[model samples]
Target: ASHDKQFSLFLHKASAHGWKVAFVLEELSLSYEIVLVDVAKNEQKSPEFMKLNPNGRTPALIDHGNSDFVIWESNAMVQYVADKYDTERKISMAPGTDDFYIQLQWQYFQGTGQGPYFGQLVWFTLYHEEKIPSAVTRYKEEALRVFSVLERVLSNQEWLVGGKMTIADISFVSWNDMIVHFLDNFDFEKEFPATAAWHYKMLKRPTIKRPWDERRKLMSR
Candidate 1:
């Protein structure tokens, strides 16, 4: 079923997933509208927004036509739109492959391990939010270690999984890219060559530009 909730979504421009999915939709030529929720301002906590998304997180989506179906998680929205549209099938995970499961494995790997660890690293290193020395060290050490896994995986291929390109590759691209924006001190050249190469390659995609660059351009005004 087609939707129309003004295609309204909550987002934060600096976020990687938001930038990626925003670009993915544009790339797929799917239509959408985005509204950024300023985390610093606690915009996501508004009771009105909370009624739509209980988690009070940005990247929540609403389909106006359905009115009742609100999808909150960022990855779920990416997969939903890709599966529903993307008729060319240029970028999506093909179901039922060992490749498919493996793709999903790493997706969660980032969410479960990578994203959290990196987040904590940022908490202490960039934001100075966390005070405990053990917590900070644990997060930074674990994040860099998990990052090594990505370095090794990108070792044999140009992209993640079956290699032609899938949402998995596209999804991770902006996330890592956005991380760099916040943690300017992070250096990929000395730490992980393969990952740095992979990131540079993914960032070059034509579709990839719309989410981050164009969105930023629009917002700059």
Candidate 2:
């Protein structure tokens, strides 16, 4: 179920998810190519895009050197990269072990549970233009609840699983970076020091160093 194959990571400069995968891929020291997309133009909706990702999302990938295997969805992509590429267990737990499942639990929690609430918070607060306090309040509270969960866990442990950093921890970097924009006048550093400490700690990793720098340039434009 594994082989030496190169990955074609279709990324968007403005898309946080793509960079999340990029961080993982770099941490594993794997070989991969980058194909950038322009989310502003909805280029992902084109016929050519469908060939890469039927769902029209960035972070789509093709394991070209391995029978041209294809996958979309960021969390699933992260899991695949970890499960298959981390043969040395560089940044992941052993597959099918309890810790592996625990890592997976965090991944799903971030992707399904926290990500959407934060996304809604941003959409309504900044991009929506029209004011809707009721919805924004609900979103902010819900997203804060997610943050509390993270704070509680990180407050106790150094990492989300395996007593070490994994892609599950990396998965939250994208959202954690944007939490400020998600809620206005909120001081994440002072409020959730544990989560804040972990978030900033991850940013310093070499894996994210280049990706974060490149993303800053892209996000500004």
* Candidate with the greatest TM-score versus the true structure: 2
Predict model 1's lDDT versus the native.
Answer: 0.71
- lDDT by residue (1-221, candidate 1, tens digit) is 34443356668765655666676676677667778788788888989778867888777776553554688777777776677676677776666567767767766776677666777777787678557778777876786787688888787777777766777767777657656655547887667888888777777877776566766675585
Each prediction's RMSD over C-alphas, in Å, is 3.2, 3.1
Highest lDDT: give the candidate number. Answer: 2
Q: Supply candidate 1's per-residue lDDT for 206.
A: 73
Candidate 2 stretches with Cα past 4 Å from truth are 1-5
Q: After best superposition, candidate 1 residue 127: deviation in angstroms? A: 4.5
